[PDB]
Design a protein around this ligand. Structure first.
Ligand code: CUE
Length: 346
């Protein structure tokens, strides 16, 4: 017996379809489970609409992190009001039977489900452009000085379609987010979307979300993760395959530089060599983004020959924006305001 019979043995509320809360919410179904707790679909009888309710684990560490999430969401909707910056809206939060509950607007499926529905052929570059433009606008809103919110977990699963037919999207799940002045975790971002500065144990800021976005946008058009590392060493090596060795002025400040790279006696950094006799990674910078996108060969799978918005010129603009987003240097990596001025969006 936990929490008078309402919790399982892992601090999760035992969800029962049809249960009514506070004469208002009718719990309909489980829609997701995570380390923070659970997310259920529920009908809000008072407002006559569906909602998604995040039920935080009945346990202090998860309660405290979600209390930060609530504060960040409340800060955001104090600066948004009209919900025009593609951020999920917190409708309400409350305690119910020793669980912090976060009520969000109901949304459609996430960008990974969309990819799986294309059987990982990817979506068109035109739809990728629309998603990119809305995400850069969302990041510009996060970069508002009073906010300065780092999401820290941008990935296709955390971007939801508003309606299954429309192209409008929203960023969800600020459960790991922090303001720039209040960073507290070091092992952050899901691995495929993790920035070099996080991999390198360096201090991080809002530029790490732009790195995730660049990775996300390529995957949305190709159907496959750009950097699908199985662990931290593999992830950096897949990054290096495409982008080359990071600038020396970065690695010379990098607490974990020697987890991946070696300094040669003459100051120039190289990769740590793979173990005798196993196939090497492709040499640094030789897995060209140019060929991943299929810039000159009809895009991914050669499927886009003659398609509008997929000319070589369009692919070259997209490639350029991606490389600006995948800059190793978080000071020079393109910023939301300037990504919005990029010719990819013209
Ligand atoms: O915040 C979230 O975190 C999650 C974490 C998971 O592991 C799975 C699903 C969710 C999830 O689905 C939603 C649907 C909405 O309409 C709004 C918010 C969310 C939301």
């Amino acid at each position: 017996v936990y929490n008078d019979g309402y919790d399982d043995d892992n601090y999760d509320y035992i969800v029962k379809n049809g249960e009514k809360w506070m004469d208002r919410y009718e719990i309909d179904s489980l829609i997701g489970k995570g380390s923070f707790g659970q997310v259920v679909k529920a009908y809000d009888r008072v407002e006559q609409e569906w909602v998604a309710i995040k039920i935080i684990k009945n346990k202090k560490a998860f309660l405290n992190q979600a209390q930060i999430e609530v504060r960040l969401l409340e800060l955001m909707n104090k600066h948004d009001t009209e919900m025009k910056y593609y951020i999920v809206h917190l409708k309400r939060h409350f305690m119910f039977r020793n669980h912090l509950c976060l009520v969000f607007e109901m949304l459609s499926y996430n960008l990974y489900d969309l990819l799986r529905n294309t059987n990982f052929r990817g979506v068109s570059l035109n739809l990728t452009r629309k998603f990119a433009q809305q995400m850069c606008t969302a990041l510009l809103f996060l970069a508002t000085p009073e906010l300065s919110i780092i999401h820290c977990d941008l990935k296709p699963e955390n971007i939801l379609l508003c309606n299954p037919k429309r192209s409008a999207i929203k960023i969800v799940d600020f459960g790991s987010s922090c303001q720039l002045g209040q960073r507290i975790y070091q092992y952050i971002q899901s691995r495929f979307y993790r920035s070099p500065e996080v991999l390198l144990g360096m201090p991080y800021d809002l530029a790490i979300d732009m790195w995730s976005l660049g990775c996300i946008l390529v995957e949305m058009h190709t159907g496959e993760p750009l950097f699908s590392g199985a662990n931290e060493v593999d992830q950096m090596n897949k990054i290096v395959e495409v982008l080359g060795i990071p600038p020396a002025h970065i690695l010379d400040q990098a607490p974990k530089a020697r987890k991946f790279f070696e300094k040669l006696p003459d100051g120039t950094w190289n990769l740590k060599k793979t173990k005798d006799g196993k196939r090497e990674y492709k040499p640094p910078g030789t897995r060209k983004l140019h060929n991943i996108l299929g810039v000159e060969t009809g895009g991914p799978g050669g499927r886009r020959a003659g398609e509008s918005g997929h000319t070589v010129a369009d692919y070259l603009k997209f490639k350029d924006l991606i490389l600006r987003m995948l800059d190793y240097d978080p000071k020079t990596r393109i910023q939301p305001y300037y990504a919005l001025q990029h010719s990819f969006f013209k």
